[PDB]
């Protein structure tokens, strides 16, 4: 009785975006506690990736909120474990996060294209409002970090950027 | 001299959306004073529908504001009286309002589709920004009310939800 | 079971004074946004007639609350559109509103005479408290406005009085 | 070089209590948004189970911080989806959570017994400080909730207890 | 490594929008100091066009910010001098600014159409969010000024609107 | 359905602990009001033992809250009148309290050894957290008062230590 | 007469622990003022190790207070001069500190075991509360310091970590 102009493949897409967000929350959680391991001991990346872990959880809840708003049905799936147990250098992890956000960005743009093909005017604006530009700004930020992590180099530079920039 | 990329059927659509909003303001006004009748005596729905009556008036003024912004001409028509003189149970009225907002939602989505076909980029975003998601959230809210009004049932439950939720 | 000394004919007059108030509100809303149109562009008039639209909408709602309080039943009719689509000069519009308020005063006086004949002291005093003096002042204000608008003439004076007096 | 009196089997129990906590968090997130669905529409339950989702997610992270502090290595597994897609009545859901917390208490007690057998006083006291009493209270709270939900019955009472007690 | 779904003709369009904004900043700067010439001595238009000069500079920087966000390359060109060295009456200059903003509005709508044809979902929303409605409201405002500058007429009227409205 | 890892013996032992703190509370009240008697008239000792009476009462209430929290059943017994109807000198009653608290301490340690023997890890930590260390601080306090009340002697010593240290 | 459940060997062990905690403060005091030597001139390390020395002297007084509370007897031995008059680099001193903390941790765990095997439930919990988890926190912290000291390297890095992290 509330569902209106809400295509069933869109509802499917929304249910798949939820898992991808939760999967990205779990990767940043792994990364965050990787930098908390004594042998890595980078507390600034810890802080930086715990916050990314929190925010990607919020994104998943926004989609579940969205799924209920439009009259859809939320269906959850296993949250896959992250592709690695350790994440290398600070620069390595940022690199791995850039690739994660680009992949999430394509799913969001495909989800938008799908919704657009089915005439879902509110769903498109909704994805634009809550996701399309945050993704762009998240990706620009990781790129910047990577350039800067290259410039400062390993060793003291890595300590510094971790402390004075991340967190 | 200001009109730019503003199709004349769009201007017509905007003029018809104005009347539909004013017609919905008038229905919620009828509903609001129906609950003020001693034989109904639901002061919380009174408050809830007076506020919906005010907000649907504001929507109509936003469109008139919009009509003048884009270079169009506002043409007003008779505001039809509401389809009923009394509105039944609290649950009945919410049900009648859900159906009103769904109908308004389709007109807004058709108005958007029309504007889109004529390339009106600003008009589309404008409808999305001011209407498409407020409609979605208004519809989700009425649905929720209806589920809750079913759960509490008639009698004391109806008194309670009126007092402790509506207004 | 609350109706007392409330005559059926008085109930009908209230019902029709309600529709009359909604109609003056619609007329002022029309004038308000006529002055928002770029080809007119008198911002003060726009604010002046928009708040007059809000006020005669509140008159209608008082009459509606009164109808209920005394134990009548509200019956709404269509609100006919305004007279005109455009309202000419600032002075033409104030003169048009004067005529409107003037007609509105007469049916209030008619409603008062009707109630007196039915021995309805409370309805008579209610009408004097909320309407009869507040119309006398509105009519005096408009007469003042017309004179002043006549004094300052067209062009620079119309802008001046619109900016410095209305709103 | 910081590991001390930390047994490999205890490290494995922590790793699996981590995954267990993430799993209870996912289950509660599932219940939280089941109550946000319009066909259910219990706002209090939604806030109650969303904050319980946040909490058992923090349990997982404590265990993660502990694993690192004592010199183990974190190993994450997939978080299996919840049991069910819908959770029935408010009382069904609290009973389901009771069973869940109940299972979670047992493996904490198992983890405690395991650690005791390895002579691991610090890990035992850590588990008592952060988990063992905080589970006893959670289980008592849920038992209380079930009784109360049993007392107020279906319909108006479920709404009442959802509004006035959960959240 | 950050560029994603960012068409190279879009990047070209963005680089051309930058120059058009800077060109409009420079015209309003000329206009602003024209009204500062003793022989014109309109200090309110001075203030009004210095602020428009500042804001059109900001628009150009938003696009450069945009160009770097999406992974593009900023390429600057000569900022052409304004089409006139003097700008006539206050009404003449506003008229010249209306025509400037309408031209800028078409470039923005063409830039949007281009981006839309290449599927750039984020770029479209971005142009809508930062430009499409500010343009509409800037154009409605200049039109209004022009109507009012006609009404007040030359001489004292021109002094007044300059002082009491512009700035 | 909330009971877990809570042995039937422990529960019996909690019930008699309940009775033994209530017995202590009442012994301490009798002491307190003995020192309020005009023939004794030590206002410090009255305050001191009325306070300890309240604390042992709170202990008994903590123990009843724990019985409920772990899923047992409170079973109350008669509260036996205290050992004496009068308590001699100030040092005498402090000495009776030391004996009493050592009896309560040894009961708590047996209740702990019982609970340990059944693997009730939460019970053990609860007794450590609220009882075992408070008993040892109390006993040190009592031993300290006796040494001092020995050092100050009878007469003006007793009076002084009553007024300046106890209460 | 206050000694209850306090074994002869538990007491000898607190006395040995008092001396051990006194030995740590002396070593850390020695570390502290080495980093104050002109040929060393690390002010962070001095601040940081002066604090370590204070803390370990707090720990010694806690045990001295415990021995008195349980009715044992404090017996003091000489406080041996530290192993080294000089401590090398910052990372060398921190590594020495991690070794002493693991040693001190072991005899605490040893002391905890001795008391367990005598059934001293209070003494065990007392060591958990004031010592075992503090030791794990200190050992983890020291670890992190060695990893970061390796990462920042010699020279500027050693200076940087000393200023920006230690004190």
PDB file of N, CA and C in Angstrom, chain D residues 28-77:
ATOM      1  N   UNK D  28      20.703  -8.157  15.363  1.00  0.00           N
ATOM      2  CA  UNK D  28      19.926  -7.051  15.935  1.00  0.00           C
ATOM      3  C   UNK D  28      19.659  -5.971  14.898  1.00  0.00           C
ATOM      4  N   UNK D  29      20.666  -5.630  14.092  1.00  0.00           N
ATOM      5  CA  UNK D  29      20.420  -4.742  12.965  1.00  0.00           C
ATOM      6  C   UNK D  29      19.262  -5.258  12.115  1.00  0.00           C
ATOM      7  N   UNK D  30      19.249  -6.565  11.833  1.00  0.00           N
ATOM      8  CA  UNK D  30      18.130  -7.142  11.104  1.00  0.00           C
ATOM      9  C   UNK D  30      16.813  -6.882  11.824  1.00  0.00           C
ATOM     10  N   UNK D  31      16.730  -7.217  13.126  1.00  0.00           N
ATOM     11  CA  UNK D  31      15.474  -6.972  13.841  1.00  0.00           C
ATOM     12  C   UNK D  31      15.139  -5.485  13.879  1.00  0.00           C
ATOM     13  N   UNK D  32      16.146  -4.631  14.104  1.00  0.00           N
ATOM     14  CA  UNK D  32      15.901  -3.189  14.171  1.00  0.00           C
ATOM     15  C   UNK D  32      15.131  -2.697  12.955  1.00  0.00           C
ATOM     16  N   UNK D  33      15.548  -3.098  11.765  1.00  0.00           N
ATOM     17  CA  UNK D  33      14.883  -2.566  10.584  1.00  0.00           C
ATOM     18  C   UNK D  33      13.656  -3.361  10.183  1.00  0.00           C
ATOM     19  N   UNK D  34      13.506  -4.589  10.684  1.00  0.00           N
ATOM     20  CA  UNK D  34      12.220  -5.257  10.547  1.00  0.00           C
ATOM     21  C   UNK D  34      11.125  -4.435  11.219  1.00  0.00           C
ATOM     22  N   UNK D  35      11.426  -3.843  12.373  1.00  0.00           N
ATOM     23  CA  UNK D  35      10.412  -3.028  13.021  1.00  0.00           C
ATOM     24  C   UNK D  35      10.232  -1.669  12.355  1.00  0.00           C
ATOM     25  N   UNK D  36      11.155  -1.255  11.472  1.00  0.00           N
ATOM     26  CA  UNK D  36      10.990  -0.025  10.695  1.00  0.00           C
ATOM     27  C   UNK D  36      10.104  -0.232   9.467  1.00  0.00           C
ATOM     28  N   UNK D  37       9.985  -1.469   8.975  1.00  0.00           N
ATOM     29  CA  UNK D  37       9.073  -1.792   7.878  1.00  0.00           C
ATOM     30  C   UNK D  37       7.642  -1.332   8.177  1.00  0.00           C
ATOM     31  N   UNK D  38       6.999  -0.644   7.203  1.00  0.00           N
ATOM     32  CA  UNK D  38       5.628  -0.140   7.425  1.00  0.00           C
ATOM     33  C   UNK D  38       4.648  -1.197   7.894  1.00  0.00           C
ATOM     34  N   UNK D  39       4.789  -2.439   7.430  1.00  0.00           N
ATOM     35  CA  UNK D  39       3.815  -3.444   7.833  1.00  0.00           C
ATOM     36  C   UNK D  39       3.951  -3.823   9.302  1.00  0.00           C
ATOM     37  N   UNK D  40       5.049  -3.455   9.963  1.00  0.00           N
ATOM     38  CA  UNK D  40       5.227  -3.684  11.399  1.00  0.00           C
ATOM     39  C   UNK D  40       5.101  -2.380  12.179  1.00  0.00           C
ATOM     40  N   UNK D  41       5.992  -1.413  11.918  1.00  0.00           N
ATOM     41  CA  UNK D  41       5.897  -0.037  12.404  1.00  0.00           C
ATOM     42  C   UNK D  41       5.829   0.012  13.934  1.00  0.00           C
ATOM     43  N   UNK D  42       6.890  -0.490  14.557  1.00  0.00           N
ATOM     44  CA  UNK D  42       7.081  -0.284  15.984  1.00  0.00           C
ATOM     45  C   UNK D  42       8.332   0.559  16.148  1.00  0.00           C
ATOM     46  N   UNK D  43       8.200   1.878  16.278  1.00  0.00           N
ATOM     47  CA  UNK D  43       9.408   2.727  16.331  1.00  0.00           C
ATOM     48  C   UNK D  43      10.297   2.451  17.542  1.00  0.00           C
ATOM     49  N   UNK D  44       9.715   2.174  18.710  1.00  0.00           N
ATOM     50  CA  UNK D  44      10.527   1.938  19.897  1.00  0.00           C
ATOM     51  C   UNK D  44      11.415   0.717  19.771  1.00  0.00           C
ATOM     52  N   UNK D  45      10.834  -0.414  19.340  1.00  0.00           N
ATOM     53  CA  UNK D  45      11.628  -1.616  19.069  1.00  0.00           C
ATOM     54  C   UNK D  45      12.792  -1.322  18.127  1.00  0.00           C
ATOM     55  N   UNK D  46      12.548  -0.496  17.102  1.00  0.00           N
ATOM     56  CA  UNK D  46      13.569  -0.172  16.108  1.00  0.00           C
ATOM     57  C   UNK D  46      14.766   0.516  16.753  1.00  0.00           C
ATOM     58  N   UNK D  47      14.501   1.518  17.595  1.00  0.00           N
ATOM     59  CA  UNK D  47      15.560   2.181  18.345  1.00  0.00           C
ATOM     60  C   UNK D  47      16.179   1.238  19.385  1.00  0.00           C
ATOM     61  N   UNK D  48      15.360   0.408  20.036  1.00  0.00           N
ATOM     62  CA  UNK D  48      15.903  -0.540  21.001  1.00  0.00           C
ATOM     63  C   UNK D  48      16.883  -1.515  20.347  1.00  0.00           C
ATOM     64  N   UNK D  49      16.485  -2.160  19.244  1.00  0.00           N
ATOM     65  CA  UNK D  49      17.394  -3.127  18.619  1.00  0.00           C
ATOM     66  C   UNK D  49      18.505  -2.475  17.784  1.00  0.00           C
ATOM     67  N   UNK D  50      18.340  -1.236  17.333  1.00  0.00           N
ATOM     68  CA  UNK D  50      19.467  -0.617  16.649  1.00  0.00           C
ATOM     69  C   UNK D  50      20.608  -0.326  17.625  1.00  0.00           C
ATOM     70  N   UNK D  51      20.298   0.168  18.825  1.00  0.00           N
ATOM     71  CA  UNK D  51      21.369   0.437  19.774  1.00  0.00           C
ATOM     72  C   UNK D  51      21.962  -0.850  20.342  1.00  0.00           C
ATOM     73  N   UNK D  52      21.189  -1.940  20.386  1.00  0.00           N
ATOM     74  CA  UNK D  52      21.771  -3.233  20.731  1.00  0.00           C
ATOM     75  C   UNK D  52      22.675  -3.752  19.614  1.00  0.00           C
ATOM     76  N   UNK D  53      22.328  -3.479  18.356  1.00  0.00           N
ATOM     77  CA  UNK D  53      23.264  -3.759  17.277  1.00  0.00           C
ATOM     78  C   UNK D  53      24.580  -3.016  17.488  1.00  0.00           C
ATOM     79  N   UNK D  54      24.511  -1.708  17.802  1.00  0.00           N
ATOM     80  CA  UNK D  54      25.730  -0.928  18.041  1.00  0.00           C
ATOM     81  C   UNK D  54      26.546  -1.507  19.192  1.00  0.00           C
ATOM     82  N   UNK D  55      25.875  -2.004  20.232  1.00  0.00           N
ATOM     83  CA  UNK D  55      26.602  -2.453  21.414  1.00  0.00           C
ATOM     84  C   UNK D  55      27.373  -3.752  21.156  1.00  0.00           C
ATOM     85  N   UNK D  56      26.712  -4.792  20.627  1.00  0.00           N
ATOM     86  CA  UNK D  56      27.455  -6.030  20.384  1.00  0.00           C
ATOM     87  C   UNK D  56      28.490  -5.847  19.267  1.00  0.00           C
ATOM     88  N   UNK D  57      28.355  -4.810  18.425  1.00  0.00           N
ATOM     89  CA  UNK D  57      29.466  -4.423  17.550  1.00  0.00           C
ATOM     90  C   UNK D  57      30.645  -3.863  18.340  1.00  0.00           C
ATOM     91  N   UNK D  58      30.373  -3.167  19.455  1.00  0.00           N
ATOM     92  CA  UNK D  58      31.448  -2.692  20.327  1.00  0.00           C
ATOM     93  C   UNK D  58      32.068  -3.834  21.125  1.00  0.00           C
ATOM     94  N   UNK D  59      31.263  -4.800  21.557  1.00  0.00           N
ATOM     95  CA  UNK D  59      31.847  -5.999  22.148  1.00  0.00           C
ATOM     96  C   UNK D  59      32.884  -6.610  21.214  1.00  0.00           C
ATOM     97  N   UNK D  60      32.519  -6.797  19.944  1.00  0.00           N
ATOM     98  CA  UNK D  60      33.463  -7.379  18.998  1.00  0.00           C
ATOM     99  C   UNK D  60      34.756  -6.575  18.977  1.00  0.00           C
ATOM    100  N   UNK D  61      34.638  -5.247  18.969  1.00  0.00           N
ATOM    101  CA  UNK D  61      35.821  -4.401  18.877  1.00  0.00           C
ATOM    102  C   UNK D  61      36.682  -4.439  20.134  1.00  0.00           C
ATOM    103  N   UNK D  62      36.072  -4.528  21.336  1.00  0.00           N
ATOM    104  CA  UNK D  62      36.836  -4.801  22.566  1.00  0.00           C
ATOM    105  C   UNK D  62      37.646  -6.076  22.467  1.00  0.00           C
ATOM    106  N   UNK D  63      36.975  -7.184  22.180  1.00  0.00           N
ATOM    107  CA  UNK D  63      37.682  -8.422  21.906  1.00  0.00           C
ATOM    108  C   UNK D  63      38.804  -8.204  20.888  1.00  0.00           C
ATOM    109  N   UNK D  64      38.554  -7.399  19.836  1.00  0.00           N
ATOM    110  CA  UNK D  64      39.616  -7.120  18.861  1.00  0.00           C
ATOM    111  C   UNK D  64      40.764  -6.338  19.490  1.00  0.00           C
ATOM    112  N   UNK D  65      40.454  -5.324  20.298  1.00  0.00           N
ATOM    113  CA  UNK D  65      41.509  -4.569  20.962  1.00  0.00           C
ATOM    114  C   UNK D  65      42.258  -5.475  21.951  1.00  0.00           C
ATOM    115  N   UNK D  66      41.546  -6.421  22.574  1.00  0.00           N
ATOM    116  CA  UNK D  66      42.163  -7.331  23.537  1.00  0.00           C
ATOM    117  C   UNK D  66      43.121  -8.296  22.843  1.00  0.00           C
ATOM    118  N   UNK D  67      42.640  -8.969  21.798  1.00  0.00           N
ATOM    119  CA  UNK D  67      43.477  -9.815  20.963  1.00  0.00           C
ATOM    120  C   UNK D  67      44.815  -9.150  20.646  1.00  0.00           C
ATOM    121  N   UNK D  68      44.780  -7.881  20.243  1.00  0.00           N
ATOM    122  CA  UNK D  68      46.018  -7.160  19.964  1.00  0.00           C
ATOM    123  C   UNK D  68      46.816  -6.901  21.234  1.00  0.00           C
ATOM    124  N   UNK D  69      46.146  -6.504  22.314  1.00  0.00           N
ATOM    125  CA  UNK D  69      46.879  -6.092  23.511  1.00  0.00           C
ATOM    126  C   UNK D  69      47.728  -7.229  24.066  1.00  0.00           C
ATOM    127  N   UNK D  70      47.186  -8.452  24.061  1.00  0.00           N
ATOM    128  CA  UNK D  70      47.858  -9.618  24.612  1.00  0.00           C
ATOM    129  C   UNK D  70      48.848 -10.239  23.631  1.00  0.00           C
ATOM    130  N   UNK D  71      48.869  -9.768  22.391  1.00  0.00           N
ATOM    131  CA  UNK D  71      49.831 -10.228  21.424  1.00  0.00           C
ATOM    132  C   UNK D  71      49.386 -11.351  20.512  1.00  0.00           C
ATOM    133  N   UNK D  72      48.085 -11.608  20.396  1.00  0.00           N
ATOM    134  CA  UNK D  72      47.570 -12.463  19.349  1.00  0.00           C
ATOM    135  C   UNK D  72      47.442 -11.733  18.016  1.00  0.00           C
ATOM    136  N   UNK D  73      46.874 -12.449  17.045  1.00  0.00           N
ATOM    137  CA  UNK D  73      46.642 -11.952  15.697  1.00  0.00           C
ATOM    138  C   UNK D  73      45.159 -12.089  15.398  1.00  0.00           C
ATOM    139  N   UNK D  74      44.544 -11.019  14.899  1.00  0.00           N
ATOM    140  CA  UNK D  74      43.125 -11.093  14.570  1.00  0.00           C
ATOM    141  C   UNK D  74      42.926 -11.835  13.254  1.00  0.00           C
ATOM    142  N   UNK D  75      41.947 -12.736  13.229  1.00  0.00           N
ATOM    143  CA  UNK D  75      41.538 -13.445  12.016  1.00  0.00           C
ATOM    144  C   UNK D  75      40.018 -13.359  11.919  1.00  0.00           C
ATOM    145  N   UNK D  76      39.513 -12.683  10.888  1.00  0.00           N
ATOM    146  CA  UNK D  76      38.077 -12.501  10.728  1.00  0.00           C
ATOM    147  C   UNK D  76      37.493 -13.549   9.786  1.00  0.00           C
ATOM    148  N   UNK D  77      36.274 -13.980  10.085  1.00  0.00           N
ATOM    149  CA  UNK D  77      35.520 -14.899   9.249  1.00  0.00           C
ATOM    150  C   UNK D  77      34.302 -14.170   8.712  1.00  0.00           C
TER     151      UNK D  77
END
